[PDB]
């Protein structure tokens, strides 16, 4: 739906069980490039949501428009004030699901390749692998090449 | 005073009290874009000054010319050798104060939003928020957009 | 041998003794820009090799072609599958040695400047110093300027 990179992003929190803890993967994806940010958090309150959103922006640039679900972190006064103050349009009207699934498959593969190592490493390598290594179809480009 | 990004930077150390420790915020700011680096350090010796300066350069690019105060870390043989070896003009002739103040206000806001979380997180989110989110006047651009 | 940045990289693991432990510096260098990645690892199995290679790619971009020695991490089924899946040509035919030496000299200098601080800090500052600060001859440019 975005017409160029950083026009319109989609965001949701998805859940990932590892060692009997259910982590909150905060996931943002550009609707034009398919480029992704994901932050592994223990929670999904406004303090973690704003934080993941800043991580995403540091990696992808500032979006003009974000679309989320009606989850309460996204509807909090803290998140609306953030978006208003920094001129980010926020609406609340599949890309994220499909991106979640690709993330989780890479995350699982990296956990098994390196079982000794922390969850954060696997998330990181999943993230960078998807954006920079993965060649997309029909374009022949990576998300990173289309985005930047 | 700089004519384009990375022509001339201003640098100083400012102090920030948190939990009865006075941290040294090493702050560099581009005089053209207003783009900022800040590193939270426990000290301001040459080893920390060179380190913050490398953090700044990794984030902003290499400057042609830096201007500092006469603080001893900046006048150390270690810092002069660094600047000489890598062809960075160093002179020792408000932008930093005003930038300090904006940093500290964002840092305080993030500490109160997230009281449970470490100082480093608040510094980081202050830093990225100021460079990438904040829209400057009359230009309508962020520091990041002007700088890069 | 590369005709522009990210055409052809050279990679090897070199060893660095610090406090009676022999670390594995995984080193990648672009044959055109001379730009470098180095990751300090405890080991050189496929899990660490793929990880250092992702660190390198995050910093330098995705290469078309990599050349390594016949070390077993590079010949592992895991590393060949990685290269095949993401369309990176891998051959197994001085740049790395000379780069190792420059890295190690900067690493030693930073350890002595800051003896109190961890090895990882010295590696990091060595890495960024070499890519961004060091002016190369006859070009007058840093590795970073040529690469990006
Ligand atoms: Mg949701
Ligand atoms: Mg001072
Ligand atoms: Mg070898």
Residue numbers in the entry:
A (entry chain A), B (entry chain A), C (entry chain A): 54 to 146, 155 to 209
Text taken from the publication that reported this structure:
IN first catalyses 3′-processing of the vDNA ends, exposing reactive 3′ OH nucleophile groups that it uses to attack a pair of phosphodiester bonds within target DNA (tDNA), resulting in strand transfer. In this work, we determine the three-dimensional structure of the deltaretroviral intasome and characterize its interactions with its host factor, the PP2A-B56γ subunit. The deltaretroviral IN host cofactor B56γ14, as part of the heterotrimeric protein phosphatase 2A (PP2A) holoenzyme, interacts with a number of chromatin-associated proteins and potently stimulates concerted integration activity of deltaretroviral INs14.
To aid the interpretation of the cryo-EM map, we generated a high-quality homology model of the STLV-1 IN/NTD using the SWISS-MODEL server, and determined a series of X-ray crystal structures spanning the catalytic core domain (CCD) and the C-terminal domain (CTD) of HTLV-2 and -1 IN.
